[PDB]
Design a protein around this ligand. Structure first.
Ligand SMILES: CC(C)(C)[C@H]1Cc2cc(F)ccc2S(=O)(=O)N(C[C@@H](O)[C@H](Cc2ccccc2)NC(=O)O[C@H]2CCOC2)C1
Ligand SMILES: [Cl-]
Ligand SMILES: [Cl-]
Lengths: 99, 99
């Protein structure tokens, strides 16, 4: 698809069998999702945003479907205001910026 | 152009006669630039992100050149860690996400 930016680029994602709404975010290096349970072990990570650096849980090799496209990669879980799909997964679905 | 997302989508912009590096950010509703002087009146605004909120100065009807494309809109000025080109100006240069 071709997504214009007059409104937030929100899409449906599927993770752990659940449907959620997430923002396609080219300004985010990593994918960060609101609190949920994911399988396996997690590692600590700090992510810096507009208000500073914060603590999240890093889960690797997580299966996630984004707007019908299958991706498998790192998902960070923590107190984010919105679910964010970052560049680590946008590359997997072949997403580019065009003008 | 077509911009891939293996690295941060950083571009050169021209604002208030100065050249600056900025991030093309689909996850940002608004454009936020590091401390600088801009002409005209401003009003205070709070903007929220990962890590909480920052206080910025809102300048309206500001011209920016982004990749050679002229655009006009609201520019927020404040203690942002990176210069961000948000949706308000990405729409003006005809920027879309494609996959
Ligand atoms: C809340 C949301 C709607 C999404 C956004 C809120 C927002 C709204 C605006 F109008 C303007 C700016 C911002 S913002 O700037 O707050 N932001 C945009 C993100 O793309 C930031 C940009 C950025 C990049 C580097 C340093 C600071 C900021 N990335 C980010 O937090 O990456 C983190 C997140 C995961 O990867 C690293 C989050
Ligand atoms: Cl605007
Ligand atoms: Cl358009």
């Amino acid at each position: 698809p071709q997504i214009t930016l007059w409104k937030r680029p929100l899409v449906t994602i599927k993770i752990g069998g659940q449907l959620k709404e997430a923002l396609l975010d080219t300004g985010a290096d990593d994918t960060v999702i609101e609190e949920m349970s994911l399988p396996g072990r997690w590692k600590p990570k700090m992510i810096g945003g507009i208000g500073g650096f914060i603590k999240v849980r890093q889960y690797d090799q997580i299966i996630i479907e984004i707007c019908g496209h299958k991706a498998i990669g790192t998902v960070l879980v923590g107190p984010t205001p919105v679910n964010i799909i970052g560049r680590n997964l946008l590359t997997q679905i072949g997403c580019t910026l065009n003008f």
